[PDB]
Design an enzyme around this catalytic site. Structure first.
Site, mmCIF file in Angstrom:
data_model
loop_
_atom_site.group_PDB
_atom_site.id
_atom_site.type_symbol
_atom_site.label_atom_id
_atom_site.label_comp_id
_atom_site.label_asym_id
_atom_site.label_seq_id
_atom_site.Cartn_x
_atom_site.Cartn_y
_atom_site.Cartn_z
ATOM 1 N N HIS A 113 0.487 -1.418 6.640
ATOM 2 C CA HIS A 113 0.090 -0.988 5.276
ATOM 3 C C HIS A 113 0.188 0.613 4.898
ATOM 4 C CE1 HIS A 113 0.020 -5.235 5.087
ATOM 5 N NE2 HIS A 113 -1.179 -5.534 5.464
ATOM 6 N N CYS A 136 1.565 -1.992 -0.272
ATOM 7 C CA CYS A 136 2.809 -1.481 -0.104
ATOM 8 C C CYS A 136 3.320 -1.788 1.300
ATOM 9 C CB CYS A 136 2.851 -0.187 -0.589
ATOM 10 S SG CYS A 136 4.689 0.565 -0.472
ATOM 11 N N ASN A 142 -2.118 -1.552 10.744
ATOM 12 C CA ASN A 142 -1.500 -3.027 10.361
ATOM 13 C C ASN A 142 -0.525 -2.975 9.372
ATOM 14 O OD1 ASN A 142 -5.061 -3.032 9.245
ATOM 15 N ND2 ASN A 142 -4.454 -4.146 11.136
#
Ligand SMILES: Cc1ccsc1C1=NO[C@@]2(CCN(Cc3c(F)cccc3F)C2=O)C1
Ligand SMILES: Cc1ccsc1C1=NO[C@@]2(CCN(Cc3c(F)cccc3F)C2=O)C1
Lengths: 266, 270
Positions: A192, A227, A190
């Site tokens: 991330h 992040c 995804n």
């Protein structure tokens, strides 16, 4: 791996691989975190929940809800060596109406001795709003049915380090790694930064002198934000031996996570 | 894993883990490279050679000699999924005066079908002088006893891609990832960037459009120099239902070559 007879916990064994050990000739913190994730994912699959890393029920997916990490706490008593067989048992428990706990116990398979334990807090988040969202008890019963009725705690002690609050360290930090950039290889399915990358970033902030003389007994991370692929991160630490940690965005100073590590002499 | 009955090859099985798969829902190139390294290390241990990553014999240790990688070649026909069991057989062969070859065959354990294969060239270096060395007969005999007498090739075809020379791409490169810095997690047990990190750095140079539509069938790396903890690296690529890239890894400051590579890609239709 396999569900236990009562169907309320899951067990899986691993043989530690030569590439999974670091400088101390035992499994890295990153390997331990990966094995904790693996047995958790196999457990989710065994009870019919999503295997995408959100561990959802039918009704959560309808309601646009996902499980996200609030806290992870790992304690290692003894790191296993190359060729050691370890057995990890994992289970979930209610953690108030908003949350669940996942616990793990790590045994040396040969001796049956506990060499580590871990616990995590998960909260239900609306995937569109990023807000915590409570659902009725009937939605919660979908997952609570796969959890022990009577509390099982890997951390049954009264004032557990695993529940201790983490303060924000004051700058300037005693130790820091500035301008860390995630690689493609650091991204989950995804886009991330994955958990092992955060752990690596936290350990980057530890002085080499500590790495050369100590090993990690406990790590605690409280997560605030994900992040992104294009985010630039500063990893800070100070002594609180024990360290406070703070991961923050280079531009804005926005908190990504905060942490605590406890170290023992080699 | 285990030595085979004849003691001249080694076999190990792995169950692909949920975290070992990438965007294509199958094991990453990095995972495959890790499994190839693992069965190679277990094989070295089983025949009494060093497990420190230099795979030394008694006489090599006397002479201050270590094996270092000159080339690695991986070919994947099909990446295994989460829960698949794969079996990797590995063995070594003499490679002329200059060194040794390690070969691997990767099978889907369930069907017995070959889903990939790999080969590597190693050369002998004096660990103090960094000078390459032709192999003494004393050192030759110590390892040749653990190698098939009639050569076995994972790449038995005529003019194998595995032996194809890699030219230096001309700058400016079409695609680049500049200023890559190794993490503590990327260091081998001798403080050098590990092989999986080089493979990752090579793949960073591939356009996202290619990652989105293709998967890697082959990677070839020729190694020149080790990257140190404080080294900063530029990863460059250019083009050379199929496409091929040249790769060059070089130090940001000096421009000194770390390694060069070739990747070959196949379009995914679903
Ligand atoms: C370890 C991991 C990695 C990605 S998400 C995640 C989770 N760990 O704990 C969670 C919380 C709820 N839950 C579902 C669940 C039960 F609630 C009960 C029994 C089995 C079962 F899968 C989880 O798995 C999320
Ligand atoms: C795979 C790997 C990871 C770190 S170094 C390394 C090597 N792969 O190939 C080498 C070349 C020589 N050699 C010794 C050796 C034999 F020569 C014969 C039989 C077993 C055996 F270990 C190797 O293992 C180095």
């Amino acid at each position: 791996g396999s569900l236990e007879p009562d169907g309320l916990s899951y067990k899986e064994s691993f043989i530690v691989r030569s590439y999974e050990v670091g400088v101390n000739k035992t499994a890295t913190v990153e390997t331990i975190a990966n094995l904790l994730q693996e047995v958790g994912c196999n457990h989710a699959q065994s009870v019919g929940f999503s295997t995408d890393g959100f561990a959802t029920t039918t009704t959560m997916r309808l309601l646009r809800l996902i499980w996200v990490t609030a806290r992870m706490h790992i304690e290692i008593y003894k790191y296993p060596a190359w060729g050691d067989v370890v057995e990890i048992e994992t289970w979930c428990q209610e953690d108030g109406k908003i949350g669940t706990r996942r616990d793990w116990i790590i045994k040396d398979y040969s001796t049956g001795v506990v060499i580590g334990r871990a616990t995590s807090k998960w909260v239900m988040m609306n995937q569109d709003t990023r807000r915590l969202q409570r659902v009725n008890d009937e939605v919660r019963e979908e997952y609570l049915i796969f959890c022990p009725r009577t509390p099982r705690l890997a951390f049954p002690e009264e004032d557990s380090d695993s529940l201790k609050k983490i303060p924000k360290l004051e700058e300037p930090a005693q130790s820091s790694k500035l301008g860390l950039v995630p690689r493609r290889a650091d991204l989950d399915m995804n886009q991330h930064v994955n958990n092992v990358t955060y752990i690596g970033w936290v350990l980057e902030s530890i002085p080499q002198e500590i790495i050369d003389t100590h090993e990690l007994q406990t790590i605690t991370l409280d997560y605030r934000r994900e992040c992104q692929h294009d985010d630039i991160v500063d990893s800070l630490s100070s002594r609180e031996c024990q360290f406070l940690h703070f991961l923050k965005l280079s531009g804005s100073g926005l908190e990504i996570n905060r942490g605590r590590t406890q170290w023992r002499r080699l």
